[PDB]
């Protein structure tokens, strides 16, 4: 019902404000059942429909979204819907750099441990957020830690002291987005994603090292992918390659209870 509500249930009502309390309760619902965690994601779309149609209010909206951002989001199948929502939510004009930095950094921490579908979903989102707020570029590039040839030995000493005295300021447990020091922290996870086993995800991570020439990547073609889709895409690809054979010789596939797989027996 929550999934179909904004599309099929709402445009047939006379007064859609009747469902506002139901949607608010479902959005605020936090139960002991593990399956109950996904109903804010489904409730948010129909809730925002009423909020946009009739000028109505949900208190602490962005703090609630920062609460919703959690490691389960990368694994839930409904994340494409939530990212479609977060695009127009974080495309707001009256947003602070601390707030958008908090969202970027939490999404980075989520991409640390996530499927490549989620990584492909998040990477252009971070690019677009940095593109809309260029004060968040200090999270990728801090000029204070660059050593240039044209600097004094005293400046070299100050840079060395600053390097050995740096600590991470980001506070993961902080609920309020603005009070996290994510704008002071940096994005090491996006650099770690450059060394990713999927060749396409690796290059998509490399776009953060490249200059920011392009505007937004049109999230719709990145939102759709899954594990089955990646296999079909690689099986039907334009380039054809000669397979390569390993020249090293292994005696046995399995270790006996030289061997290719230690710790595994026949």
């Amino acid at each position: 019902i929550l999934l179909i509500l904004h599309k099929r249930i709402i445009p047939h009502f006379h007064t859609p404000t009747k469902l506002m309390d139901f949607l608010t309760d479902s959005y605020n619902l936090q139960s002991s059942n593990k399956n109950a965690g996904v109903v804010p994601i489904l409730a948010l779309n129909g809730l925002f429909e009423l909020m946009k149609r009739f000028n109505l209010e949900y208190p602490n909206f962005y703090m609630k979204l920062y609460q919703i951002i959690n490691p389960d989001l990368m694994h839930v199948k409904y994340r494409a819907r939530f990212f479609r929502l977060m695009d127009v939510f974080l495309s707001s004009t009256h947003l602070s750099a601390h707030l958008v930095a908090s969202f970027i950094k939490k999404l980075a921490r989520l991409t640390l441990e996530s499927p490549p579908s989620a990584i492909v979903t998040v990477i252009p989102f971070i690019y677009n957020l940095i593109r809309k707020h260029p004060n968040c570029m200090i999270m990728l590039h801090n000029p204070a830690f660059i050593s240039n040839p044209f600097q004094t030995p005293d400046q070299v000493a100050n840079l060395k002291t600053l390097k050995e005295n740096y600590v991470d300021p980001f506070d993961v447990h902080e609920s309020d987005p603005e009070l996290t020091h994510a704008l002071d922290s940096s994005l090491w996870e996006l650099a770690s994603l450059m060394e990713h086993y999927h060749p396409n995800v690796a290059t998509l991570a490399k776009i953060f090292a490249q200059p920011f020439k392009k505007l937004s990547y049109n999230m719709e073609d990145f939102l759709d992918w899954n594990y089955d889709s990646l296999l079909n895409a690689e099986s039907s690809r334009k380039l054809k390659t000669l397979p390569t054979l390993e020249f090293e010789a292994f005696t046995n596939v399995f270790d006996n209870e030289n061997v290719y797989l230690p710790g595994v027996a026949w």
């Binding site: 593990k34 959690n70 490691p71 694994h75 921490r109 991409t111 640390l112 441990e113 996530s114 499927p115 490549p116 570029m137 999270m139 990728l140 590039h141 801090n142 204070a144 830690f145 390097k163 740096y166 991470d168 922290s185 994005l187 090491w188 996870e189 650099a191 770690s192 060394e195 086993y197 999927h198 060749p199 953060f208 090292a209 200059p211 920011f212 594990y227 089955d228 990646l230 296999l231 380039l239 390659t241 397979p243 390569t244 054979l245 390993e246 020249f247 010789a249 292994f250 005696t251 596939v253 399995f254 270790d255 209870e257 290719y260 797989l261 230690p262 710790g263 595994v264 027996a265 026949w266």
Partner: protein, 345 residues
């Protein structure tokens, strides 16, 4: 020259039975040890110098020999384990020798087998997967260069194994041991290129938390609420003694009967120590070179701290935490500067 070519590929530069049914028809008359001799006789009969067109038939023999290896591994081998190991080792050596000449049709058969494996998994989840699939991944790891960035056979298998690690619900010890085998295979895939698998991190956190969580209480610790696990009933009792020696090696044939039998605590500890050994290997190889090592290792640090607090005897968390603390103290953690560009003329 071969090492240089491998490093460039790492950087990014790019009668004879025609059916496995007929192979099984001959194999039924043959004995278990007579299968390598029969295969060698078939190769000697259909060598290309003998007659025209023997190359295509011998390539079909490559395909059906791989299929027969998978079928023999799928079939039960508890009675003749030593003879089965000898026959399979000889068959795999023969397979490498022929794959040196006929890698193309073999690679096509492997890609088709990957597609069939994914179709069966989408049909029936964990029940479709088998020891034949595991040994297929292991054989692929030898036959093809895993360090290469975009390999026609390694990358579909790699994303399939990552899908298996991230997707299947580890509710039984059979599934946990299957995942541990997949982690070991993925590590031996990435032994050279040393790329980063987030699914391996996810699997390690999930498995450590499942074995931490008390079975009788069936309630996770409060700080581990972010990690979502599958079965709370799987757990490790306090009364077990880790001072007793256990074998870290897990056999493939034990996995089938291990689900049927009631789970024994010693074998659970063996699977746990196997996973911990794989985790130690990944920490030493990949994560310490990654720039986000401190951000990766924090849930692992908390889970191993819980292990140390609960069980004072089991030395592996103290060893891993000493290694991790030394690495985190040694490595430098400074803000990134990725947008530094050479000026344009």
């Amino acid at each position: 020259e071969l090492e240089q070519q491998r490093l460039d590929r790492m950087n990014g530069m790019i009668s004879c039975p025609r059916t496995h049914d007929a192979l099984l028809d001959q194999v039924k008359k043959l004995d278990l040890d007579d299968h390598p001799k029969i295969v060698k006789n078939i190769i000697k009969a259909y060598q290309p110098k003998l007659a025209e067109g023997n190359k295509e038939k011998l390539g079909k023999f490559t395909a059906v020999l791989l299929r027969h290896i998978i079928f023999l591994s799928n079939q039960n081998y508890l009675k003749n384990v030593q003879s089965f190991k000898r026959t399979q080792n000889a068959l795999i050596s023969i397979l490498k020798s022929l794959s040196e000449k006929y890698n193309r049709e073999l690679s096509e058969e492997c890609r088709d087998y990957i597609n069939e494996m994914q179709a069966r998994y989408k049909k029936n989840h964990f029940d479709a997967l088998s020891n034949g699939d595991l040994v297929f991944f292991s054989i692929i790891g030898i036959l093809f260069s895993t360090s290469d960035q975009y390999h026609l056979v390694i990358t579909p298998a790699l994303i399939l194994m990552s899908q298996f690690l991230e997707q299947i619900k580890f509710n039984s010890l059979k599934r946990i041991a299957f995942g541990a085998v997949l982690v070991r295979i993925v590590s031996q895939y990435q032994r050279i290129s040393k790329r980063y698998i987030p699914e391996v991190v996810y699997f390690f956190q999930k498995i450590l938390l499942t074995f931490i969580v008390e079975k009788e209480n069936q309630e996770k610790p409060l700080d581990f609420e972010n990690i979502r696990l599958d079965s709370y009933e799987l757990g490790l009792p306090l009364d077990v003694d880790f001072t007793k020696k256990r074998s870290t090696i897990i056999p493939l044939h034990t996995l089938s009967t291990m689900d049927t039998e009631a789970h024994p605590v010693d074998q659970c500890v063996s699977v746990l120590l196997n996973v911990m050994e794989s985790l130690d290997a990944t920490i030493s190889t990949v994560w310490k070179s990654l720039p986000a090592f401190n951000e990766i290792i924090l849930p692992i640090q908390q889970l191993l701290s819980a292990y140390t607090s609960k069980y004072s005897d089991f030395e592996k968390p103290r060893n891993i935490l000493n290694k991790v603390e030394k690495l985190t103290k040694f490595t430098e953690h400074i803000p990134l500067a990725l947008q530094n560009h050479k000026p344009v003329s």
